[model samples]
Target: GEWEIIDIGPFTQNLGKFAVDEENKIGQYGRLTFNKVIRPCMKKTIYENEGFREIKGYEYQLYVYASDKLFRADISEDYKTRGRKLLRFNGPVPPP
Candidate 1:
């Protein structure tokens, strides 16, 4: 729960699919509700939008300090609303 929020925007559809189950180990919890998703990229090369994977449920792609590719993304899932998804950004950084 040690997260520092950086930026945020509306959810969209043009971005790529976030295959959390394939990449992050946090997916093993079996559909647990999470407010954040962190994707660690060990490479030094920047991405198409300057080292940012354009998320499907987020706009306003922002860049972080180029020290490391640690993406800590924020998402909001309203179980009461049934199907509402909101994704936020908190900047990318190296592991502590």
Candidate 2:
């Protein structure tokens, strides 16, 4: 997947817009956050099971809100593992 720049904002604003090429992907409206830090990398050993790749830092996160308003996912960096992590929420969200 690729991200297309939609808008840019100053660092203090800490907000921007991006559009994905994928269709019917991501939620109609949602929020996502990501954090990164420098650290050693680890990986699993196995054929076709590539391990982690070394990098200055590691972090990843994804949040998806579906149009149905009943589907969403909140994922964030795994600080302990220093690897990619994810969390998903399915079904309707209660009115706040």
Candidate 3:
């Protein structure tokens, strides 16, 4: 969801350091809780080699065409339909 949202607060699980500030850290490890779910926003800092972005770092699932985002709440369009533009890239790291 890259262009719509109501309110995307409340992390599905526990939170950690990045909850404070991440500019001081890149590739730095953070903590998560049990069954922590990862949205498109959580990808930038974690190791993602999944079905959505199996292509790796080069595969920017949510970049290009639209502004990028790190946190899901930025440009989240969860209300949109699935399997297409439902959940897209929004918050962090933009494109050229």
Candidate 4:
């Protein structure tokens, strides 16, 4: 599966418009099919209130599988570092 990557710069602002669901889908409204599977490259926090209270020098990345495509973006860091690094690479598509 090829990754349709959006730089962390533009992708960060784009998250404000879309809605993410527990089912791993990201899009507007319930008609969502944009992100089919999502894999976050960060530590999973198991808390009721706040998982990420404050992280200054930490960064993370995420990969989402849309209806017919894949999306890789940085959620809380400058994509310039890792984002641009892996912008174009090949690997076996992880199963959803």
TM-score of 2: 0.25
In the order shown, the candidates' Cα RMSDs to the true structure are 13.4, 12.8, 13.4, 13.3
lDDT value for model 3: 0.25
- Model 1 scores what on Cα lDDT? 0.30
Question: Per-residue error at 48 for model 4, in Å?
Answer: 25
Model 2 stretches astray by more than 4 angstroms: 1-65, 68-72, 79-83
Candidate 4 total steric clashes: 1
| Candidate that would win on lDDT | 4
Q: After superposition, how far is residue 40 of candidate 2 from its true place, in Å?
A: 34
TM of each candidate vs. truth? 0.26, 0.25, 0.18, 0.29
**CA lDDT of each candidate?**
0.30, 0.28, 0.25, 0.36
Ranking by lDDT: 4, 1, 2, 3
List model 3 lDDT by residue over 6-33, tens digit each: 2213432222122312212332323221
Q: List the residue pairs that clash in candidate 1.
A: 6-90, 47-51
- Model 1, range 1-96, lDDT digits (tens) per residue? 112233222221111124222224354323422233222211122233643764222222322222234334333333334332324334334553
Report the C-alpha lDDT of model 2 over 1-96, residue by residue, as the tens digit.
Answer: 212222222321221111111212454334433221111112222222235443333222222233434322333334345443333344444422
Report the number of backbone clashes for model 2.
Answer: 1
Give a tens-digit lDDT track for model 4, residues 1-96: 112333444443334223233223422223335443353334222232354544233233455544554554434333234322222211224643
User: Where does candidate 3 have its weakest 10-residue lDDT segment?
Assistant: 58-67
